[PDB]
Amino acid sequence: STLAKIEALLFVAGEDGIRVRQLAELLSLPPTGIQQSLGKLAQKYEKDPDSSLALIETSGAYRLVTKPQFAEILKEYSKAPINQSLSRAALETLSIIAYKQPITRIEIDAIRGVNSSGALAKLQAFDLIKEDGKKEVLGRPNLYVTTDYFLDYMGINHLEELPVID
């Protein structure tokens, strides 16, 4: 089956997921057709009461995961970094970068009121944020942004999909 082929791959990738585009260059089908199967699949799982899986699309990739219910169970067994929550400091520091992006360490500290050195590291250690641009000042500052992992961690595909200040 094509459903079987998708699942197979999607399974092998696991947490890393796969992109519709790359799924076509492997099955030899039109990117528009995968979309269709991928829906039939996620639906096959939905109905099946004996299935624990679910299709999910974050950071523009489709990933094979577990239906939300089993979280209570698995929470004991897994505890992989993506399911671990974050410290209020990192959470807030992350927010600032997320939006005021690209930004600098001092700018964050300014906005945040205190030193962010500790958060920048933790967040960077988790591949959530990464340093991209550079700054033209009497100090050669570094600019911080967000990685693709940030989308995934947030469960969205595009940055714009973030809540909005209302």
């Binding site: 577990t66 939300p68 807030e92 250690a125 947030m154």
Partner: protein, 147 residues
């Protein structure tokens, strides 16, 4: 005594007055701050650290606001302390809306990508001493930065 910085504390005091954002309750709030700054430091003066440097910014405000109307600085060095507290709130909140949107994502679990191994497959030397370094270094960070 466990608040995420000075700006965080202001948002607590400024809060009390409900109503709109500021609405001239400054001169008042400022006092309350030093209150916790001096009374709490009467016995336990250990976690001052940054808050201290804030006490300073206030002094000037209380002071320079006394002098009459001579681009006024007695004011700008006030309206700015407001903007700081406002923008902080905005993120203190946007911060919560992330720890919330994250939770949903965390309800889903997956498997480590199966490391396939094939005969013909040949090695690409696209990795270097730098890579291998940050690599082991990271794993060190992640876990160590936790309890």
């Amino acid at each position: 005594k466990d608040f995420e910085g000075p700006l965080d504390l202001l948002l607590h005091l400024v809060s009390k007055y409900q109503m709109d954002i500021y609405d001239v309750p400054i001169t008042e709030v400022i006092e309350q701050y030093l209150a916790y700054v001096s009374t709490l430091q009467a016995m336990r003066l250990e976690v001052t650290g940054e808050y201290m440097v804030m006490a300073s910014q206030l002094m000037l405000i209380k002071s320079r606001k006394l002098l009459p109307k001579v681009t006024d600085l007695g004011d700008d060095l006030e309206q700015d302390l407001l903007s700081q507290i406002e923008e902080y709130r905005k993120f203190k909140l946007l911060g919560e809306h992330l720890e919330a949107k994250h939770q949903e994502r965390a309800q889903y679990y997956s498997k480590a990508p199966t490391e396939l191994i094939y005969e013909d497959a040949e090695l690409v030397h696209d990795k270097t001493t730098i890579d291998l370094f940050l690599a082991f270094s990271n794993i060190l960070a992640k876990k160590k930065e936790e309890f």
